[PDB]
Amino acid sequence: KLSLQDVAELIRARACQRVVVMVGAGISTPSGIPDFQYDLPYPEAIFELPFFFHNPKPFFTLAKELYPGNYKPNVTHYFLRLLHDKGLLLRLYTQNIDGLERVSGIPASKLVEAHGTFASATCTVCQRPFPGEDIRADVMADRVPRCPVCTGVVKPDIVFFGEPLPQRFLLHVVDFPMADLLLILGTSLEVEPFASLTEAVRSSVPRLLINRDLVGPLAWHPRSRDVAQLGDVVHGVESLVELLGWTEEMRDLVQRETGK
Template sequence: MAANTVKSTEGIHCIANSNPCIKTLENDVLSVLKSSKRIIVLAGAGMSVSCGIPDFRSADGLYNTLDLEELGLNCPEDLFDMESFIENPSSFYKFAKRLYPGNVQPSLTHKFLALLQKKNKLLRVYTQNIDGLEVEAGVTSKKVVYAHGSLAVAQCLKCNLKFDAKHIATEVNEGKVPTCVSASRTVKKKGSLKRKGSQQKSNTMEDSNKRGEKNVSDLGTGTLSPKSKRLKRRAATRHNGTRDDLTSERSDDVEDEVGVDPKNYPNNNICGGLIKPGVTFFGEKLEDRVGKALEADREKVDALLVIGTSLSVSPMSKVLRYLPPSIPRILINRNEVVLPKMCADEIDSDDEEDTRDGYIFDASLLGNCDDVVKGIMCALAWKIEEGLESTTLAEPCGSDTGLTEVVGRNYFFPGALVVSLEEDEYEEEIVHCDGCRKKIATNVVMKCTQCFDFDLCYECFPKVSKKHYRGRHKFKSEKI
């Protein structure tokens, strides 16, 4: 789509807050919000821009404003790359300290999600954000699925201990790279757990050292041995928990409690491993909970809100084609969204055909997320203060919704951009095989047609597909 143009098949409906304009908004959007009881929200970075957190791809977004020299990065994408994090974790922590829990307050849009929950209209929030502001705003943690992980939790890459981010808050806010200070431990071997320094020290580790192999402590230096790579992969497995259910959680492979005082042990014997935030870095596979939650919610959802995201990162860009095409879809974003061709072409499910002709969303509310949400709430006469403390609107809106123009299915609010993303601006998809857990190097993958994100490489397909749901699920080849 060319710049400064708006795609429309129905022409201009109205301008400003005229009665026809409000009536159109009522028919296309407000009626859906009034009648729906099980809304799924796909949330993106645009929700948090008003909180002082930049989005990724806009002119003043993260990718265009990041000081690469200051952070020691070659390109913006390195900030969320696992290998780059291992080599230079200070880059990530210098940037991320402003996002950590307690340093940022929720926006009006975050509070709007909590209001949907209070009105018993919210089924689930699938957020691509890592700031945890949905829960801060009042959405219960059980209704939030972190597609890309959360800063609210962290994990030691050496001993695999998982814990609440508050344990590293001091170091992060001081710009330091946090390391694990719990009592030193080793990983289980064949059912036994041995502490370093004990008389039961494993001969396996000694033999490994004699052969010149590096042990897991190398994770703190950036040098990875085969063993430490295996541990790193296990440690990098995403966990979509929240502060409540992951506080002081520990891996099954370790003992002791989080926050153990190292002074209680001889020779100050502490772990010292590098701590990785609980976020999903580029190239990592989504945690199983994302797919399982979508598979369960698919049968319940009655409306979809896409807020503050261009849906340019897979596999979340495929959610639209996975959910039933019959449900209403509403977009709240600064600009229109164009799905990758593969997602747009295959948006029909096995059971239903998408009757939309030439469009994806039933209504696109274009503008700053907070301005759009404020307009919706004014039109619905909803008030944020209903049961939510200290979350009132900044000022009364009266009958002014902020809506300036309606063109086709596009509704324009303050901050709207009339330039759509081109298909080639979308992130290249990285797919991991759910059989061997390796990155699929070919451009074709065998995908389960009934699961949201279950993929197999050609090598694993013959055997694993027969075990997957006892062979009852169908697979199809798909280009990536």
């Protein structure tokens, strides 16, 4: 039965070369963004379209808090930037909307932002697309951005409840059979379709979870080549970096990107 060091030796030895990563809220709480006053009837209303059409301000408040400049990526994000720079990253699937994967300098072509992005926006009425800078001034100024043609509300391309996942989500059809290593960081992947995706890699493919606890389909339906590195996600990432011999590259990358 496989340990963290075995996975590290697989990666070091390049016997693992096409890593598919899935990430959630647990990688972003170390940047100071919590998981899960706002003038909301219940939590989920912030991402429901009917509530939004009736009162778009609470969402726009969250958007202002999440625009670039409030948070910075942490060692977790930079570890993933490192996999990319070392030619190991096939795709990174994220449930986060903080954009820190792309901020950490992972290219868009490597990202599936499965819950969408603030980088672009769409008129809710005529479906015209707009770069997210175009509404930036309005959000920063607590104004509801309006379509310059139909007056419709222009909403950032955050996926709301009941909306299809983005088109790029389709890449899962090719990435998951192609994966030779599955890395899950900071999420349990409790809900569909993320749950079944852990089940879509080939039986011979190690699945490595760095997470608070052993939960989700790794707990429910284990396979022989699974590894759990339980506890603090930052500590787990650091142990893995440390077994890979990437300590110096972590430090180089972090100080290049963030000053120190």
